From a paper:
[name] ([name]) is an ubiquitous enzyme expressed in all somatic cells that plays a central role in glycolysis where it provides energy in form of ATP through the reversible phosphotransfer reaction from 1,3-bisphosphoglycerate (1,3-BPG) to MgADP in order to produce 3-phosphoglycerate (3-PG) and MgATP in the presence of free magnesium. [name] is a monomeric enzyme of 417 amino acids formed by two distinct α-helical domains of equal size, the N- and C-terminal domains connected by a hinge region. The N-terminal domain binds 3-PG or 1,3-BPG while the C-terminal domain binds MgADP or MgATP. Two different crystallographic conformations of [name] have been already identified: the partially closed conformation, able to bind substrates, and the closed conformation, the catalytically competent state.
G166 is located in the 3-PG binding pocket interacting with the substrate C2 through its main carboxylic group. G166 is one of the residues lining the 3-PG binding site and its substitution for the bulky and negatively charged aspartate modifies the shape and the charge of the substrate binding pocket. The structure of [name] reveals that the aspartate Oδ is engaged in a salt bridge with the R38 NH1 (OD-(D166)-NH1(Arg38) = 3.3 Å) altering its capability of interacting with 3-PG. These modifications of the pocket impair the binding of 3-PG, that is not present in the structure, and the stabilization of the transition state through R38, thus affecting both kcat (5.9 s-1) with a 15-fold decrease, and KM (1.54 mM) increased 4- fold. Mutation of the other residues involved in 3-PG binding, R65W, a positively charged arginine with the non polar tryptophan, and [name], a substitution of glycine with a negatively charged residue, leads to an increase in Km values and, in the case of [name], also to a reduced turnover number. As shown in the structure, the introduction of a negatively charged residue in the 3-PG binding site alters the affinity of the protein for the substrate (which is not found in the structure) by occupying part of the binding site and by engaging the R38 in a new salt bridge. The occurrence of undetectable unfolding intermediates may be the case of R38M and [name], as suggested by the non coincidence of the [Urea]0.5 values obtained by far-UV CD and fluorescence changes, mainly due to the differences in m value.
Numbering used by the authors: 1 to 416
The structure:
Amino acid sequence: SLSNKLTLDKLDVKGKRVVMRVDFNVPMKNNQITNNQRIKAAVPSIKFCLDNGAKSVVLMSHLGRPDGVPMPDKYSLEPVAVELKSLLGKDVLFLKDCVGPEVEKACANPAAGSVILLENLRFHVEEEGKGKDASGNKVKAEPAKIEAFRASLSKLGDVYVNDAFDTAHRAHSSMVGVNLPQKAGGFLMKKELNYFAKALESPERPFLAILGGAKVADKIQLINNMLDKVNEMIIGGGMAFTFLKVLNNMEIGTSLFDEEGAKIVKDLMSKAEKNGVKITLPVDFVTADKFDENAKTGQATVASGIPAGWMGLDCGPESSKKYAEAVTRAKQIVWNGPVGVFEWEAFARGTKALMDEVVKATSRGCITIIGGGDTATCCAKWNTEDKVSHVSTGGGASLELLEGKVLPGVDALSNI
Ligand SMILES: Nc1ncnc2c1ncn2[C@@H]1O[C@H](COP(=O)(O)OP(=O)(O)O)[C@@H](O)[C@H]1O
Ligand SMILES: [Mg+2]
Ligand SMILES: [Mg+2]
């Protein structure tokens, strides 16, 4: 299935106008781009089109949270057009809208090899289908205007490419509303489809899931679905304290505890036993007197408990050994969620040590897949993006795939 979607390498673009949805939602500090990695990531798809004789590449994206009102002073894509030109080595024409007669005329039959970047899709309520007015009240798009917006986008190319996996979980106009005969995943999308097909359809084995992060209750369906796919699961991060309080009566102090998640811990452990999944929980911890980067630190074990007032913010050295044992056994790994508060150096050792192990595993042929969002931020922070098999470009989207969902943007792509 994820396997059988049309991708850009299989799409004839010679003489065609290409309308391409890209992820240019770059971090900003008052209109200046603080990280251009997303822009670089789209260059292979763009260059492929140009190298294979595309008449034009029209780029559409969003930036920030305009909520369906034009906010060009705060969330304009104009700075991205400057940065893209530098990265591509080609002129980029920036348009101050993304739909309407002037845009359509500009994109109808441009000079061959033209690269065009449109203004922020989310200045229009029709993109998301909803937004907020100037009073901050919810507005709903009108069907006739959604149809018009979609029809306008559809005029801007002869074929469609979606290289914006980070939005593919949303049934937005630019994801599902472009009415062209061929709709292909770009090269970023292709890597997401391929690697998550390994995670979901045909894993190498033993297959290990490393599930960390903060909250349990938002990860129930993720854990549940992964328990149908994996042979081993590490449960780490803040989630672990709910499991340990329930199963061991551990004293956890002020560590994160999920009162709803607590009521399904035994249900998940039961499913793991039923499917033969080996669960690895942490056994030791770095503690902190408060949730702060420069908190006083201590140590604890499951047996010692955590003192009243104190929280467990990372795993300890014996946990790291047990985690490394599981990684050593694995031929495929999916990792969603850091195993400690990686943002702060005092509480990053567990996540860094585990990253080191996943990198070593990759070196001897382990297929290693990092989910988007905070686990991906870890790879960027320690320069390991090139040393694991795959770092997903979409946090929410990777999580929804791993839950077992059909992503509307993926489903909209042409088959075969
Ligand atoms: N022991 C812990 N206590 C509190 N927060 C934690 C702990 N371990 C990890 N975290 C936090 O988990 C967050 C990431 O979790 P999550 O958002 O679920 O990850 P992802 O974006 O990878 O899905 C980070 O902000 C990190 O600081
Ligand atoms: Mg249409
Ligand atoms: Mg993540």
